[PDB]
Amino acid sequence: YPIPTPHSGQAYDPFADFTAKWTRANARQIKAQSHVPVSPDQNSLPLNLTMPDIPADFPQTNPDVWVWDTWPLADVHGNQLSFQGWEVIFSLTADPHAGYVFDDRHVHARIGFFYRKAGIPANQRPIDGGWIYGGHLFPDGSSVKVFGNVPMTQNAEWSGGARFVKNNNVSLYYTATSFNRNAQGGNITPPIAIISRADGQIQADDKHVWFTGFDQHLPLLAPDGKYYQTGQQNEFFSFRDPYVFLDPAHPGKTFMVFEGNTAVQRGSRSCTEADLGYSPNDPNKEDLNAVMDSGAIYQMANVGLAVATNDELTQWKFLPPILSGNCVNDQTERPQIYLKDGKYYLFTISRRTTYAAGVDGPDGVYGFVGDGIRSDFIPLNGLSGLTLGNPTDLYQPAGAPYALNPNQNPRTFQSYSHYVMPGGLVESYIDAIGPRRGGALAPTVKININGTSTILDRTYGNAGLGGYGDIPANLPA
Numbered sequence: 001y002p003i004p005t006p007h008s009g010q011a012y013d014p015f016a017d018f019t020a021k022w023t024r025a026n027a028r029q030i031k032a033q034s035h036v037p038v039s040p041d042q043n044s045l046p047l048n049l050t051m052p053d054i055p056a057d058f059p060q061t062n063p064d065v066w067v068w069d070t071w072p073l074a075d076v077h078g079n080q081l082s083f084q085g086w087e088v089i090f091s092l093t094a095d096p097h098a099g100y101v102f103d104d105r106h107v108h109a110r111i112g113f114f115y116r117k118a119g120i121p122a123n124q125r126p127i128d129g130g131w132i133y134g135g136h137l138f139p140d141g142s143s144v145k146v147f148g149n150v151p152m153t154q155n156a157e158w159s160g161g162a163r164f165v166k167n168n169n170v171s172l173y174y175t176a177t178s179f180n181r182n183a184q185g186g187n188i189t190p191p192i193a194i195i196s197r198a199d200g201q202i203q204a205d206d207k208h209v210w211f212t213g214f215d216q217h218l219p220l221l222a223p224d225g226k227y228y229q230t231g232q233q234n235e236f237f238s239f240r241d242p243y244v245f246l247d248p249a250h251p252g253k254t255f256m257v258f259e260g261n262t263a264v265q266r267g268s269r270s271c272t273e274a275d276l277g278y279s280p281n282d283p284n285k286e287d288l289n290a291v292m293d294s295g296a297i298y299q300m301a302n303v304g305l306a307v308a309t310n311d312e313l314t315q316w317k318f319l320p321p322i323l324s325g326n327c328v329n330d331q332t333e334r335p336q337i338y339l340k341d342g343k344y345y346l347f348t349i350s351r352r353t354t355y356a357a358g359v360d361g362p363d364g365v366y367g368f369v370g371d372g373i374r375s376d377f378i379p380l381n382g383l384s385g386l387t388l389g390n391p392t393d394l395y396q397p398a399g400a401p402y403a404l405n406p407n408q409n410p411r412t413f414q415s416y417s418h419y420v421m422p423g424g425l426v427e428s429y430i431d432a433i434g435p436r437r438g439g440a441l442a443p444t445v446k447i448n449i450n451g452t453s454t455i456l457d458r459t460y461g462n463a464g465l466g467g468y469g470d471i472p473a474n475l476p477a
């Protein structure tokens with residue numbers, strides 16, 4: 001049982017060169033806290049860190065749309081806003097009746113919007129959450145203009161966030177992606193990912209919500225290979241998922257966290273003793289060269305920070321990363337800064353299959369707490385970093401959502417893209433429950449966030465499961 005790396009939570013200047021590490025000694029706490037499942041149970045995780053089992057008879061959010069990563073209409077304070085008595089969400093969408101299969105939908109993603117009347121308790125809405133699909137948010141061909149005349153086979157609109165803020169009242173921060181792939185899915189040139197902004201206008205009457213504008217897409221950030229990995233450094237790089245927010249500690253600034261990778265050429269032997277996170281006199285420390293030899297150098301997640309450099313928020317620059325998972329996991333996705341009781345919670349999603357050799361954990365949401373947006377972040381829950389995982393046996397193989405291992409929990413991929421909302425409510429989408437694939441919103445759940453630890457509230461809704469796609473507004477716009 002490894003000694004977890006201690007962390008102070010101390011704050012730094014957002015502009016200073018300090019990056020917190022989610023170390024191997026921290027991440028190894030997840031398996032240390034786990035138990036061999038007592039058959040026929042197939043969950044190894046601590047109950048307080050486990051998402052309840054989602055029913056196999058879940059409804060689709062819409063019969064004509066695969067929905068996955070979802071975000072609310074929000075402000076830069078993380079408030080979720082209603083507009084003229086309507087709740088509004090935005091999702092990555094694809095067409096289930098378009099010829100491509102669920103696992104191939106990502107390069108076809110379009111941002112869509114849904115709406116429903118505000119102020120109805122979840123259990124009084126239709127079981128599907130009563131979301132009305134408005135269609136695509138952006139005009140056809142508007143997003144792809146950010147790439148100009150580059151060779152391309154597909155473009156997609158990937159995740160970010162919506163900010164209620166010209167006649168325009170909504171800024172959509174998102175990830176424009178361009179692919180140049182052979183028919184087998186191999187990259188002819190590396191994918192291009194540009195964090196972008198498009199402004200438009202939400203309008204409503206008693207019947208429907210609709211949007212105008214989003215004709216002009218502004219490229220804000222693309223990786224430069226100093227702090228954030230490029231496609232030239234690694235064709236499989238990640239760079240996406242802007243969360244734009246105001247830090248009360250730095251009024252007058254607007255910040256953004258996003259997913260990146262550490263800026264190394266792929267296959268570099270770049271991990272350090274600080275990524276491993278052992279005392280040099282710990283007789284049970286791992287060996288740095290052994291860890292890199294095991295292939296852990298292919299797992300290089302980071303959480304980036306950027307700051308606006310003009311009043312209009314149309315110019316941005318990179319700051320050093322706030323969290324790295326080098327030789328731990330390749331993915332720290334959809335990061336968000338969640339403010340509670342003067343503390344800064346960094347929540348980010350990750351996958352079991354993108355852990356480095358010698359480290360393991362479930363698909364779900366990971367959490368860290370500190371005294372600022374740039375902190376020596378304290379991994380939650382016994383210095384582990386796990387906030388909430390799908391039920392998973394860490395003592396048997398992971399499998400995949402398209403090929404479940406029958407020795408593994410059939411709900412290990414039941415949900416993904418957990419987004420933490422005001423009051424600790426968590427929304428997500430359904431990926432696989434046994435042989436059924438979702439592309440529908442999951443039941444909303446509730447975590448009790450208490451200092452350095454969290455507990456899934458098993459009294460919320462029906463034995464921990466709230467409404468399908470319950471993404472409520474707390475404040476009128």
Ligand SMILES: OC[C@@]1(O)OC[C@@H](O)[C@@H](O)[C@@H]1O
Nearest residue numbers: 010011012013014016018376
């Ligand atoms: O040792 C680091 C530290 O304490 O140094 C003084 C200031 O720069 C602080 O922001 C910072 O946390």
Ligand SMILES: OC[C@@]1(O)OC[C@@H](O)[C@@H](O)[C@@H]1O
Nearest residue numbers: 019262270271272274324326
């Ligand atoms: O992997 C080595 C390291 O120096 O790379 C740059 C940053 O990610 C740091 O946090 C990290 O410790």
Ligand SMILES: OC[C@H]1O[C@](O)(CO)[C@@H](O)[C@@H]1O
Nearest residue numbers: 069106158159240241333334
């Ligand atoms: O859906 C497109 C991509 O964006 C994410 O959903 C969140 O970062 C990834 O899991 C996926 O690869």
Ligand SMILES: [Mg+2]
Nearest residue numbers: 352353355360
């Ligand atoms: Mg593994």
Ligand SMILES: [Mg+2]
Nearest residue numbers: 396406407408
């Ligand atoms: Mg078995």
